[PDB]
Amino acid sequence: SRLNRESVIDAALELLNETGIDGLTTRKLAQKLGIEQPTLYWHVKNKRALLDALAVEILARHHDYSLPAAGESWQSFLRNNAMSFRRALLRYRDGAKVHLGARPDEKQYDTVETQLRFMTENGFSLRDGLYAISAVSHFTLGAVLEQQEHTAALTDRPAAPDENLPPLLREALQIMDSDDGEQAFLHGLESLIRGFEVQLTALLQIV
Amino acid sequence: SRLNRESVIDAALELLNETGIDGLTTRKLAQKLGIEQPTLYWHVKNKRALLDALAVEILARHHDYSLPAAGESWQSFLRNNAMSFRRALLRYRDGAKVHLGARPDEKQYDTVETQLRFMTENGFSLRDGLYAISAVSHFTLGAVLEQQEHTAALTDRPAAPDENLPPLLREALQIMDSDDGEQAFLHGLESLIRGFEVQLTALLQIV
Numbered sequence: 001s002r003l004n005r006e007s008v009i010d011a012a013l014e015l016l017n018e019t020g021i022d023g024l025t026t027r028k029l030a031q032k033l034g035i036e037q038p039t040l041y042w043h044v045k046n047k048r049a050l051l052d053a054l055a056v057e058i059l060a061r062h063h064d065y066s067l068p069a070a071g072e073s074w075q076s077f078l079r080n081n082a083m084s085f086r087r088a089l090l091r092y093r094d095g096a097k098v099h100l101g102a103r104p105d106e107k108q109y110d111t112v113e114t115q116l117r118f119m120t121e122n123g124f125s126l127r128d129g130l131y132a133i134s135a136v137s138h139f140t141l142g143a144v145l146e147q148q149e150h151t152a153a154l155t156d157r158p159a160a161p162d163e164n165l166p167p168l169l170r171e172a173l174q175i176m177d178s179d180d181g182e183q184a185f186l187h188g189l190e191s192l193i194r195g196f197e198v199q200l201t202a203l204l205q206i207v
Numbered sequence: 208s209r210l211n212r213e214s215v216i217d218a219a220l221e222l223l224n225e226t227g228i229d230g231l232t233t234r235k236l237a238q239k240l241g242i243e244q245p246t247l248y249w250h251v252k253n254k255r256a257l258l259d260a261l262a263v264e265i266l267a268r269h270h271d272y273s274l275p276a277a278g279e280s281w282q283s284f285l286r287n288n289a290m291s292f293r294r295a296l297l298r299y300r301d302g303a304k305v306h307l308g309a310r311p312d313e314k315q316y317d318t319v320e321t322q323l324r325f326m327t328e329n330g331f332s333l334r335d336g337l338y339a340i341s342a343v344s345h346f347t348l349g350a351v352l353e354q355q356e357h358t359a360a361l362t363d364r365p366a367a368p369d370e371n372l373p374p375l376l377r378e379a380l381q382i383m384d385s386d387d388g389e390q391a392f393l394h395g396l397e398s399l400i401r402g403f404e405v406q407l408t409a410l411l412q413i414v
Protein backbone atom coordinates (compact mmCIF):
# COMPACT_ATOMS: atom_id res chain seq x y z
CA SER A 1 0.00 0.00 0.00
CA ARG A 2 1.00 3.67 0.23
CA LEU A 3 4.24 4.30 2.21
CA ASN A 4 4.37 8.11 2.65
CA ARG A 5 5.21 9.14 6.29
CA GLU A 6 1.54 9.66 7.11
CA SER A 7 0.31 6.29 5.90
CA VAL A 8 3.24 4.43 7.59
CA ILE A 9 2.26 6.17 10.94
CA ASP A 10 -1.48 5.27 10.48
CA ALA A 11 -0.47 1.62 9.96
CA ALA A 12 1.94 1.53 12.92
CA LEU A 13 -0.68 3.14 15.24
CA GLU A 14 -3.26 0.54 14.08
CA LEU A 15 -0.63 -2.22 14.90
CA LEU A 16 0.24 -0.72 18.33
CA ASN A 17 -3.54 -1.11 19.28
CA GLU A 18 -3.53 -4.81 18.07
CA THR A 19 -0.19 -5.82 19.65
CA GLY A 20 0.93 -3.36 22.36
CA ILE A 21 4.46 -1.84 22.44
CA ASP A 22 6.35 -5.05 23.56
CA GLY A 23 4.89 -6.98 20.60
CA LEU A 24 4.99 -4.31 17.85
CA THR A 25 7.79 -5.28 15.40
CA THR A 26 8.98 -3.90 12.05
CA ARG A 27 8.21 -7.44 10.69
CA LYS A 28 4.48 -7.25 11.61
CA LEU A 29 4.41 -3.69 10.28
CA ALA A 30 5.69 -4.94 6.89
CA GLN A 31 2.92 -7.66 6.89
CA LYS A 32 0.22 -5.10 7.71
CA LEU A 33 1.35 -2.85 4.85
CA GLY A 34 1.60 -5.81 2.38
CA ILE A 35 5.30 -5.27 1.72
CA GLU A 36 8.65 -7.07 2.12
CA GLN A 37 11.00 -6.26 5.02
CA PRO A 38 13.72 -4.61 2.91
CA THR A 39 11.05 -2.29 1.35
CA LEU A 40 9.91 -1.17 4.90
CA TYR A 41 13.58 -0.56 5.91
CA TRP A 42 13.91 2.17 3.25
CA HIS A 43 11.06 3.98 5.08
CA VAL A 44 11.56 2.87 8.74
CA LYS A 45 15.07 1.87 9.91
CA ASN A 46 14.20 0.19 13.23
CA LYS A 47 11.60 0.00 16.07
CA ARG A 48 13.19 2.89 18.05
CA ALA A 49 12.83 5.34 15.05
CA LEU A 50 9.21 4.22 14.70
CA LEU A 51 8.42 4.66 18.41
CA ASP A 52 10.10 8.17 18.43
CA ALA A 53 7.85 9.07 15.48
CA LEU A 54 4.66 7.73 17.16
CA ALA A 55 5.37 9.63 20.39
CA VAL A 56 5.38 12.90 18.36
CA GLU A 57 2.43 12.14 16.08
CA ILE A 58 0.05 10.94 18.76
CA LEU A 59 0.32 14.39 20.44
CA ALA A 60 0.25 16.24 17.10
CA ARG A 61 -3.03 14.54 16.18
CA HIS A 62 -4.84 14.18 19.48
CA HIS A 63 -3.43 16.59 22.12
CA ASP A 64 -5.44 19.73 21.41
CA TYR A 65 -4.47 21.80 24.48
CA SER A 66 -0.73 22.30 24.05
CA LEU A 67 -1.01 26.07 24.25
CA PRO A 68 -2.83 28.39 26.66
CA ALA A 69 -5.95 30.42 25.75
CA ALA A 70 -5.50 34.27 25.46
CA GLY A 71 -5.69 35.59 29.04
CA GLU A 72 -5.68 32.08 30.59
CA SER A 73 -4.30 31.68 34.09
CA TRP A 74 -1.26 29.43 34.52
CA GLN A 75 -3.40 27.28 36.93
CA SER A 76 -6.12 26.78 34.26
CA PHE A 77 -3.51 26.13 31.60
CA LEU A 78 -1.77 23.31 33.58
CA ARG A 79 -5.21 21.75 34.29
CA ASN A 80 -6.48 21.81 30.67
CA ASN A 81 -2.98 20.80 29.43
CA ALA A 82 -2.81 17.79 31.77
CA MET A 83 -6.31 16.63 30.92
CA SER A 84 -5.58 16.82 27.13
CA PHE A 85 -2.20 15.09 27.56
CA ARG A 86 -3.85 12.25 29.63
CA ARG A 87 -6.50 11.70 26.95
CA ALA A 88 -3.90 11.69 24.14
CA LEU A 89 -1.80 9.13 26.11
CA LEU A 90 -4.79 6.85 26.89
CA ARG A 91 -5.92 6.89 23.21
CA TYR A 92 -3.44 4.16 22.11
CA ARG A 93 -2.48 0.95 23.89
CA ASP A 94 0.74 1.46 25.89
CA GLY A 95 0.61 5.13 24.97
CA ALA A 96 2.55 6.34 28.02
CA LYS A 97 5.37 3.81 27.31
CA VAL A 98 5.43 5.12 23.67
CA HIS A 99 5.81 8.76 24.97
CA LEU A 100 8.55 8.02 27.55
CA GLY A 101 10.93 6.63 24.90
CA ALA A 102 11.95 10.26 24.02
CA ARG A 103 12.40 13.86 25.04
CA PRO A 104 11.03 16.81 22.92
CA ASP A 105 11.62 16.26 19.17
CA GLU A 106 12.70 19.14 17.01
CA LYS A 107 9.14 19.21 15.61
CA GLN A 108 7.88 20.00 19.17
CA TYR A 109 10.53 22.66 19.99
CA ASP A 110 8.29 25.64 19.24
CA THR A 111 5.38 24.35 21.36
CA VAL A 112 7.36 23.34 24.50
CA GLU A 113 9.52 26.56 24.35
CA THR A 114 6.27 28.57 24.42
CA GLN A 115 5.00 26.50 27.44
CA LEU A 116 8.17 27.34 29.35
CA ARG A 117 7.97 31.01 28.24
CA PHE A 118 4.33 31.25 29.41
CA MET A 119 5.21 30.03 33.00
CA THR A 120 8.06 32.52 33.23
CA GLU A 121 5.64 35.31 32.14
CA ASN A 122 3.32 34.36 35.05
CA GLY A 123 5.83 34.82 37.83
CA PHE A 124 7.85 31.60 37.83
CA SER A 125 11.56 31.40 37.33
CA LEU A 126 12.45 29.06 34.46
CA ARG A 127 13.62 26.53 37.14
CA ASP A 128 10.35 26.69 39.15
CA GLY A 129 8.18 26.75 36.00
CA LEU A 130 10.06 23.69 34.67
CA TYR A 131 9.56 21.93 38.06
CA ALA A 132 5.78 22.62 37.85
CA ILE A 133 5.67 21.44 34.21
CA SER A 134 7.69 18.26 35.03
CA ALA A 135 5.67 17.43 38.12
CA VAL A 136 2.42 17.58 36.10
CA SER A 137 3.90 15.58 33.19
CA HIS A 138 5.23 12.83 35.52
CA PHE A 139 2.19 12.63 37.75
CA THR A 140 0.05 12.22 34.56
CA LEU A 141 2.40 9.69 32.89
CA GLY A 142 2.55 7.52 36.11
CA ALA A 143 -1.21 7.56 36.49
CA VAL A 144 -1.70 6.49 32.81
CA LEU A 145 1.13 3.89 32.97
CA GLU A 146 -0.50 2.22 35.93
CA GLN A 147 -3.89 2.08 34.22
CA GLN A 148 -2.42 0.69 30.97
CA GLU A 149 -0.05 -1.90 32.53
CA HIS A 150 -2.89 -3.12 34.71
CA THR A 151 -4.69 -4.08 31.44
CA ALA A 152 -1.45 -5.81 30.03
CA ALA A 153 -0.99 -7.88 33.29
CA LEU A 154 -4.67 -8.96 33.52
CA THR A 155 -4.68 -10.51 30.00
CA ASP A 156 -1.87 -12.92 31.15
CA ARG A 157 -3.35 -13.74 34.58
CA PRO A 158 -6.27 -12.87 36.91
CA ALA A 159 -6.09 -10.60 39.95
CA ALA A 160 -5.46 -12.43 43.25
CA PRO A 161 -8.39 -13.80 45.34
CA ASP A 162 -10.09 -11.42 47.91
CA GLU A 163 -10.30 -14.43 50.28
CA ASN A 164 -7.07 -12.85 51.44
CA LEU A 165 -7.54 -9.08 50.67
CA PRO A 166 -7.66 -6.95 53.84
CA PRO A 167 -10.61 -4.48 54.07
CA LEU A 168 -9.21 -1.04 53.09
CA LEU A 169 -7.21 -2.48 50.14
CA ARG A 170 -10.35 -4.31 48.87
CA GLU A 171 -12.21 -1.06 49.13
CA ALA A 172 -9.33 0.97 47.61
CA LEU A 173 -8.95 -1.40 44.63
CA GLN A 174 -12.76 -1.13 44.15
CA ILE A 175 -12.22 2.68 44.26
CA MET A 176 -9.37 2.87 41.64
CA ASP A 177 -11.64 0.42 39.72
CA SER A 178 -14.94 2.42 39.46
CA ASP A 179 -13.86 4.67 36.51
CA ASP A 180 -10.52 4.48 34.64
CA GLY A 181 -8.60 6.29 37.49
CA GLU A 182 -10.10 9.69 36.39
CA GLN A 183 -11.29 10.74 39.83
CA ALA A 184 -7.97 9.91 41.48
CA PHE A 185 -6.18 11.76 38.64
CA LEU A 186 -8.33 14.94 38.81
CA HIS A 187 -8.10 15.11 42.62
CA GLY A 188 -4.32 14.71 42.61
CA LEU A 189 -4.05 17.32 39.83
CA GLU A 190 -5.82 20.00 41.93
CA SER A 191 -3.53 19.10 44.89
CA LEU A 192 -0.47 19.58 42.67
CA ILE A 193 -1.63 22.90 41.17
CA ARG A 194 -2.52 24.40 44.63
CA GLY A 195 0.86 23.20 45.96
CA PHE A 196 2.53 25.12 43.18
CA GLU A 197 0.44 28.28 43.81
CA VAL A 198 1.32 28.19 47.54
CA GLN A 199 5.02 28.02 46.52
CA LEU A 200 4.82 30.85 43.91
CA THR A 201 2.85 33.23 46.18
CA ALA A 202 5.25 32.70 49.13
CA LEU A 203 8.14 34.41 47.23
CA LEU A 204 11.00 34.64 49.81
CA GLN A 205 8.77 33.89 52.89
CA ILE A 206 9.54 30.78 54.98
CA VAL A 207 6.61 28.56 54.14
CA SER B 208 23.72 -23.57 40.47
CA ARG B 209 21.29 -23.29 43.38
CA LEU B 210 17.62 -22.75 42.32
CA ASN B 211 15.80 -21.90 45.59
CA ARG B 212 13.47 -18.84 45.21
CA GLU B 213 16.10 -16.51 46.66
CA SER B 214 18.93 -17.55 44.36
CA VAL B 215 16.66 -17.47 41.25
CA ILE B 216 15.67 -13.82 42.19
CA ASP B 217 19.37 -12.82 42.74
CA ALA B 218 20.19 -14.18 39.27
CA ALA B 219 17.20 -12.53 37.56
CA LEU B 220 18.00 -9.14 39.21
CA GLU B 221 21.65 -9.46 38.04
CA LEU B 222 20.28 -10.17 34.45
CA LEU B 223 17.80 -7.25 34.56
CA ASN B 224 20.86 -4.88 35.18
CA GLU B 225 22.77 -6.47 32.18
CA THR B 226 19.83 -6.55 29.73
CA GLY B 227 16.98 -4.24 30.82
CA ILE B 228 13.33 -5.42 31.00
CA ASP B 229 12.68 -5.62 27.18
CA GLY B 230 15.68 -7.94 26.75
CA LEU B 231 15.40 -10.11 29.90
CA THR B 232 14.23 -13.59 28.80
CA THR B 233 13.74 -16.93 30.59
CA ARG B 234 16.31 -18.31 28.04
CA LYS B 235 19.10 -15.91 29.18
CA LEU B 236 18.12 -16.61 32.79
CA ALA B 237 18.66 -20.36 32.20
CA GLN B 238 22.14 -19.57 30.65
CA LYS B 239 23.11 -17.38 33.62
CA LEU B 240 22.16 -20.13 36.08
CA GLY B 241 23.98 -22.85 34.04
CA ILE B 242 20.83 -24.90 33.49
CA GLU B 243 18.59 -26.16 30.66
CA GLN B 244 15.31 -24.41 29.80
CA PRO B 245 13.01 -27.22 30.99
CA THR B 246 14.83 -27.21 34.39
CA LEU B 247 14.17 -23.40 34.77
CA TYR B 248 10.47 -23.92 33.83
CA TRP B 249 9.94 -26.09 36.94
CA HIS B 250 11.02 -23.02 38.99
CA VAL B 251 9.84 -20.08 36.79
CA LYS B 252 6.89 -20.60 34.41
CA ASN B 253 7.24 -17.47 32.23
CA LYS B 254 8.59 -13.86 32.12
CA ARG B 255 5.40 -12.36 33.64
CA ALA B 256 5.68 -14.59 36.81
CA LEU B 257 9.33 -13.55 37.09
CA LEU B 258 8.60 -9.83 36.70
CA ASP B 259 5.73 -10.04 39.31
CA ALA B 260 8.23 -11.65 41.69
CA LEU B 261 10.94 -9.00 41.05
CA ALA B 262 8.50 -6.13 41.62
CA VAL B 263 7.80 -7.53 45.14
CA GLU B 264 11.38 -8.46 46.07
CA ILE B 265 13.01 -5.23 45.00
CA LEU B 266 10.81 -3.37 47.56
CA ALA B 267 11.20 -6.10 50.19
CA ARG B 268 15.00 -5.81 50.00
CA HIS B 269 15.59 -2.14 49.33
CA HIS B 270 12.53 -0.02 50.30
CA ASP B 271 13.18 0.58 53.98
CA TYR B 272 10.50 3.23 54.67
CA SER B 273 7.25 1.36 54.01
CA LEU B 274 5.87 2.16 57.44
CA PRO B 275 5.67 5.39 59.44
CA ALA B 276 7.79 6.12 62.56
CA ALA B 277 5.90 6.18 65.96
CA GLY B 278 4.35 9.66 66.20
CA GLU B 279 5.28 10.60 62.60
CA SER B 280 3.12 13.13 60.80
CA TRP B 281 1.33 11.96 57.64
CA GLN B 282 3.24 14.73 55.73
CA SER B 283 6.63 13.39 56.93
CA PHE B 284 5.56 9.82 56.24
CA LEU B 285 4.59 10.52 52.57
CA ARG B 286 7.93 12.37 52.09
CA ASN B 287 10.16 9.63 53.58
CA ASN B 288 8.02 6.94 51.87
CA ALA B 289 8.35 8.59 48.44
CA MET B 290 12.08 9.11 48.79
CA SER B 291 12.62 5.41 49.79
CA PHE B 292 10.32 4.18 47.00
CA ARG B 293 12.22 6.35 44.40
CA ARG B 294 15.57 4.95 45.53
CA ALA B 295 14.29 1.35 45.46
CA LEU B 296 12.91 1.91 41.91
CA LEU B 297 16.15 3.55 40.61
CA ARG B 298 18.30 0.71 42.06
CA TYR B 299 17.67 -1.67 39.10
CA ARG B 300 17.60 -0.89 35.38
CA ASP B 301 13.99 -0.34 34.22
CA GLY B 302 12.89 -0.64 37.83
CA ALA B 303 9.75 1.48 37.42
CA LYS B 304 8.62 -0.66 34.42
CA VAL B 305 9.23 -3.79 36.61
CA HIS B 306 6.98 -2.29 39.40
CA LEU B 307 4.11 -1.20 37.10
CA GLY B 308 3.53 -4.75 35.82
CA ALA B 309 1.45 -5.49 39.00
CA ARG B 310 -0.75 -4.28 41.82
CA PRO B 311 -0.10 -5.23 45.52
CA ASP B 312 0.85 -8.93 45.89
CA GLU B 313 -0.54 -10.94 48.74
CA LYS B 314 2.91 -10.73 50.37
CA GLN B 315 2.49 -6.90 50.49
CA TYR B 316 -1.13 -6.89 51.79
CA ASP B 317 -0.21 -6.26 55.41
CA THR B 318 2.10 -3.32 54.61
CA VAL B 319 -0.20 -1.42 52.17
CA GLU B 320 -3.31 -2.04 54.39
CA THR B 321 -1.40 -0.36 57.25
CA GLN B 322 -0.46 2.61 54.96
CA LEU B 323 -4.13 3.13 54.13
CA ARG B 324 -5.11 2.71 57.82
CA PHE B 325 -2.50 5.29 58.90
CA MET B 326 -3.92 8.00 56.50
CA THR B 327 -7.45 7.36 57.74
CA GLU B 328 -6.18 7.75 61.35
CA ASN B 329 -4.78 11.20 60.44
CA GLY B 330 -8.01 12.74 59.24
CA PHE B 331 -8.40 11.48 55.68
CA SER B 332 -11.31 9.47 54.42
CA LEU B 333 -10.15 6.20 52.83
CA ARG B 334 -10.98 7.80 49.42
CA ASP B 335 -8.93 10.99 50.06
CA GLY B 336 -6.07 9.05 51.72
CA LEU B 337 -5.97 6.67 48.71
CA TYR B 338 -5.94 9.70 46.34
CA ALA B 339 -2.94 11.16 48.26
CA ILE B 340 -1.16 7.77 48.26
CA SER B 341 -1.84 7.25 44.50
CA ALA B 342 -0.80 10.76 43.54
CA VAL B 343 2.57 10.30 45.31
CA SER B 344 3.08 6.80 43.84
CA HIS B 345 2.33 7.99 40.27
CA PHE B 346 4.27 11.23 40.46
CA THR B 347 7.30 9.18 41.70
CA LEU B 348 6.89 6.37 39.12
CA GLY B 349 6.60 8.92 36.20
CA ALA B 350 9.66 10.82 37.37
CA VAL B 351 11.73 7.57 37.60
CA LEU B 352 10.34 6.19 34.29
CA GLU B 353 11.44 9.32 32.48
CA GLN B 354 14.94 9.16 33.94
CA GLN B 355 15.33 5.43 33.13
CA GLU B 356 13.87 5.52 29.58
CA HIS B 357 16.07 8.50 28.79
CA THR B 358 19.07 6.16 29.44
CA ALA B 359 17.49 3.33 27.21
CA ALA B 360 16.88 5.80 24.27
CA LEU B 361 20.39 7.39 24.45
CA THR B 362 22.18 4.01 24.05
CA ASP B 363 20.41 3.57 20.63
CA ARG B 364 20.89 7.17 19.41
CA PRO B 365 22.24 10.58 20.49
CA ALA B 366 20.16 13.55 21.62
CA ALA B 367 19.29 16.02 18.84
CA PRO B 368 21.67 18.93 17.97
CA ASP B 369 21.28 22.27 19.95
CA GLU B 370 21.93 24.09 16.63
CA ASN B 371 18.15 24.00 16.67
CA LEU B 372 17.24 24.01 20.44
CA PRO B 373 15.42 27.20 21.50
CA PRO B 374 16.85 28.95 24.63
CA LEU B 375 14.55 27.94 27.55
CA LEU B 376 14.41 24.27 26.43
CA ARG B 377 18.26 24.18 26.16
CA GLU B 378 18.41 25.61 29.64
CA ALA B 379 15.62 23.32 30.95
CA LEU B 380 17.26 20.17 29.53
CA GLN B 381 20.54 21.34 31.16
CA ILE B 382 18.48 21.73 34.38
CA MET B 383 16.83 18.21 34.36
CA ASP B 384 20.41 17.09 33.44
CA SER B 385 22.47 18.48 36.40
CA ASP B 386 21.59 15.67 38.91
CA ASP B 387 19.45 12.59 38.16
CA GLY B 388 16.13 14.60 38.37
CA GLU B 389 16.36 14.68 42.23
CA GLN B 390 15.82 18.41 42.59
CA ALA B 391 12.79 18.42 40.29
CA PHE B 392 11.44 15.37 42.17
CA LEU B 393 11.90 16.82 45.70
CA HIS B 394 10.39 20.19 44.70
CA GLY B 395 7.35 18.57 43.10
CA LEU B 396 6.94 16.29 46.15
CA GLU B 397 6.66 19.27 48.55
CA SER B 398 4.11 20.88 46.16
CA LEU B 399 2.04 17.68 46.21
CA ILE B 400 2.15 17.25 50.01
CA ARG B 401 1.15 20.93 50.67
CA GLY B 402 -1.66 20.58 48.11
CA PHE B 403 -2.96 17.64 50.08
CA GLU B 404 -2.70 19.48 53.43
CA VAL B 405 -4.63 22.47 52.00
CA GLN B 406 -7.37 20.00 50.92
CA LEU B 407 -7.51 18.10 54.28
CA THR B 408 -7.57 21.28 56.43
CA ALA B 409 -10.35 22.88 54.33
CA LEU B 410 -12.89 20.20 55.46
CA LEU B 411 -16.26 21.38 54.00
CA GLN B 412 -15.06 24.98 53.19
CA ILE B 413 -15.13 26.13 49.54
CA VAL B 414 -11.45 26.29 48.74
Ligand SMILES: C[C@H]1c2cccc(O)c2C(=O)C2=C(O)[C@]3(O)C(=O)C(C(N)=O)=C(O)[C@@H](N(C)C)[C@@H]3[C@@H](O)[C@@H]21
Pocket residue numbers: 059063065066067081082085102103104108111112113115116133134136137379380383
Ligand atom coordinates in the same frame (compact mmCIF):
# COMPACT_ATOMS: atom_id res chain seq x y z
C1 LIG C 1 8.62 21.45 28.30
C2 LIG C 1 8.77 19.97 27.87
C3 LIG C 1 10.00 19.26 28.41
C4 LIG C 1 11.10 19.92 28.96
C5 LIG C 1 12.24 19.24 29.43
C6 LIG C 1 12.32 17.85 29.41
C7 LIG C 1 11.26 17.13 28.84
O1 LIG C 1 11.38 15.77 28.78
C8 LIG C 1 10.09 17.85 28.38
C9 LIG C 1 8.93 17.11 27.80
O2 LIG C 1 9.12 15.88 27.52
C10 LIG C 1 7.69 17.69 27.82
C11 LIG C 1 6.63 16.99 27.43
O3 LIG C 1 6.74 15.77 27.07
C12 LIG C 1 5.22 17.55 27.33
O4 LIG C 1 4.30 16.48 27.63
C13 LIG C 1 4.87 18.02 25.89
O5 LIG C 1 5.64 17.73 24.89
C14 LIG C 1 3.59 18.59 25.73
C15 LIG C 1 3.18 19.01 24.43
N1 LIG C 1 3.80 18.61 23.32
O6 LIG C 1 2.18 19.78 24.24
C16 LIG C 1 2.95 19.10 26.81
O7 LIG C 1 1.70 19.49 26.77
C17 LIG C 1 3.61 19.31 28.12
N2 LIG C 1 2.61 19.05 29.24
C18 LIG C 1 3.10 19.76 30.48
C19 LIG C 1 2.29 17.63 29.62
C20 LIG C 1 5.00 18.66 28.33
C21 LIG C 1 6.14 19.69 28.18
O8 LIG C 1 5.87 20.91 28.86
C22 LIG C 1 7.56 19.15 28.27
Ligand SMILES: C[C@H]1c2cccc(O)c2C(=O)C2=C(O)[C@]3(O)C(=O)C(C(N)=O)=C(O)[C@@H](N(C)C)[C@@H]3[C@@H](O)[C@@H]21
Pocket residue numbers: 172173176266270272273274288289292309310311315318319320322323340341343344
Ligand atom coordinates in the same frame (compact mmCIF):
# COMPACT_ATOMS: atom_id res chain seq x y z
C1 LIG D 1 -1.74 1.23 48.97
C2 LIG D 1 -1.12 0.58 47.71
C3 LIG D 1 -2.04 0.46 46.51
C4 LIG D 1 -3.43 0.59 46.59
C5 LIG D 1 -4.28 0.46 45.47
C6 LIG D 1 -3.76 0.22 44.20
C7 LIG D 1 -2.38 0.05 44.06
O1 LIG D 1 -1.90 -0.24 42.81
C8 LIG D 1 -1.53 0.21 45.22
C9 LIG D 1 -0.05 0.07 45.10
O2 LIG D 1 0.39 -0.42 44.01
C10 LIG D 1 0.76 0.68 46.02
C11 LIG D 1 2.08 0.67 45.86
O3 LIG D 1 2.61 0.14 44.82
C12 LIG D 1 3.08 1.24 46.85
O4 LIG D 1 4.21 1.75 46.10
C13 LIG D 1 3.65 0.15 47.79
O5 LIG D 1 3.45 -1.11 47.56
C14 LIG D 1 4.56 0.60 48.77
C15 LIG D 1 5.16 -0.34 49.65
N1 LIG D 1 5.17 -1.65 49.40
O6 LIG D 1 5.76 0.00 50.73
C16 LIG D 1 4.55 1.91 49.14
O7 LIG D 1 5.45 2.44 49.91
C17 LIG D 1 3.46 2.85 48.74
N2 LIG D 1 4.05 4.23 48.52
C18 LIG D 1 2.93 5.24 48.64
C19 LIG D 1 4.78 4.52 47.23
C20 LIG D 1 2.48 2.38 47.64
C21 LIG D 1 1.14 1.91 48.24
O8 LIG D 1 0.64 2.79 49.23
C22 LIG D 1 0.13 1.33 47.25
Ligand SMILES: [Cl-]
Pocket residue numbers: 001002
Ligand atom coordinates in the same frame (compact mmCIF):
# COMPACT_ATOMS: atom_id res chain seq x y z
CL1 LIG E 1 -2.35 1.94 -2.14
Ligand SMILES: [Cl-]
Pocket residue numbers: 001002003004
Ligand atom coordinates in the same frame (compact mmCIF):
# COMPACT_ATOMS: atom_id res chain seq x y z
CL1 LIG F 1 4.37 4.76 -1.71
Ligand SMILES: [Cl-]
Pocket residue numbers: 208209
Ligand atom coordinates in the same frame (compact mmCIF):
# COMPACT_ATOMS: atom_id res chain seq x y z
CL1 LIG G 1 25.62 -24.27 43.59
Ligand SMILES: [Cl-]
Pocket residue numbers: 208209210211
Ligand atom coordinates in the same frame (compact mmCIF):
# COMPACT_ATOMS: atom_id res chain seq x y z
CL1 LIG H 1 18.60 -26.28 43.81
Ligand SMILES: [Mg+2]
Pocket residue numbers: 099102103104
Ligand atom coordinates in the same frame (compact mmCIF):
# COMPACT_ATOMS: atom_id res chain seq x y z
MG1 LIG I 1 7.90 14.26 27.35
Ligand SMILES: [Mg+2]
Pocket residue numbers: 306309310311
Ligand atom coordinates in the same frame (compact mmCIF):
# COMPACT_ATOMS: atom_id res chain seq x y z
MG1 LIG J 1 2.15 -0.28 42.99
